[PDB]
Amino acid sequence: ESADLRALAKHLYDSYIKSFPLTKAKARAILTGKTTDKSPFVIYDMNSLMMGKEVAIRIFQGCQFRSVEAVQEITEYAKSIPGFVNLDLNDQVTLLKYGVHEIIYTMLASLMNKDGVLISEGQGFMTREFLKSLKPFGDFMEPKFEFAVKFNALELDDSDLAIFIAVIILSGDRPGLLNVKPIEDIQDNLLQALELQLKLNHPESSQLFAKLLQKMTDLRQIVTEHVQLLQVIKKTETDMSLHPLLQEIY
């Protein structure tokens, strides 16, 4: 009934707030928008960054660090989705493994506008053109920027995004899953809760449910495109015995 759907929605919203550092609502206030309580430090050039083992590699590695960190926040959020911990533990691991990249790029949009991205929990702001100003690394944020511009045109808020992220985790078509049935049964429930949420939250945005789902197609293409860049960078340099243990962590 509408009752357990709204219950599910509020549950997810509550744990999404608890699990992640900067909400979209706060990121929007910082960006383009209102509140400049404390302006973020802006990174627009090589100087700016320093004023903030090596620049272009420094920045791409920094994004990896945050993303490893984010995997744990996503994990904790996953385990708050009703039914998730009851799944086969191999399937939990699989769902997280193939889901975290799509989740990261989804949420990255919350931190982006067409001009740049908030980092360090909104304390910083790296400009889009400074990012594109790199060498075989000026290639890696631009498709995220192009995706975010289109995705943010849907004007979702955190309550919408909480359910959407849960939908992504409970996919069903991840390779190697052992028991697809309960996963799809949970996702069917989450899709219902999502549909309702979007109808109550955006009553005059017609077919917002459908439009948001079609965005999954662009999301997977981003992820695919990102892993192939990663494979190229794994041909920039791999041999060095000065962070073997840090290499491990990533």
Q: Applying CB under 6 A, which residues contact ligand 65W? A: 20, 22, 59, 62-63, 66-67, 70, 104, 107-108, 111, 117, 119, 126, 141
- CB of 150: closest distance to a copy of itself in angstroms? 6
Task: Look at residues 128, 209, 139, 223 and name the one whose alpha carbon lies nearest to residue 174.
Answer: 223
- What single DSSP character describes residue 235? T
CB of 124 to ligand 65W, least distance (A): 8
Residue 62 interacts with, from ligand 65W, a copy of itself, none (CB under 5-8 Å by kind): ligand 65W
Q: How far is CA 141 from CA 14, 17, 29, 128, in A?
A: 30, 26, 22, 8
By beta-carbon proximity to a copy of itself, the closer residue of 41 and 209 is 209
Quick one: what does residue 165 bind among ligand 65W, a copy of itself, none, with the CB cut-off 5 to 8 Å set by partner type? Answer: none
Cβ proximity to ligand 65W, 111 vs 190, nearer residue:
111
H helix intervals, 99-235: 100-110, 128-132, 142-152, 158-169, 180-201, 208-233
The response to whether 67 counts as a known ligand-binding position is yes
> Which residues are near a copy of itself by CB under 8 A?
150, 171, 173, 188, 191-192, 195, 206-207, 209-210, 213-218, 220-221, 224
Contact of residue 72 among ligand 65W, a copy of itself, none (CB under 5-8 Å per partner type): none
CB of 167 to ligand 65W, least distance (A): 17
* Cα 218 to Cα 223: distance, rounded to the nearest angstrom: 9
Shortest distance in whole angstroms from residue 153 CB to a copy of itself = 10
Q: How near is the Cβ of 99 to ligand 65W at its closest, in Å?
A: 13
Q: Residue 65 annotated as binding?
A: yes
Determine whether the annotation assigns residue 226 to a binding site: yes
Known binder of ligand: residue 58?
A: no
Supply 119's token pair.
Answer: 């980092």
Distance in angstroms (rounded) separating the CA atoms of residues 238 and 250: 13
The one-letter amino acid code at 19 reads S
Nearer to a copy of itself, 159 or 187 (CB): 187
- DSSP letter assigned to residue 177: -
CB 78, CB 84: distance < 8 Å: yes
How many alpha carbons fall within 13 Å on the CB side of residue 184?
Answer: 8
- Which among 108, 74, 115 is positioned nearest to 92, based on CA atoms? 74
Summarize the annotated binding site as residue ranges: 64-67, 101, 226, 250
Summarize the annotated binding site for rosiglitazone as residue ranges: 64-67, 101, 226, 250
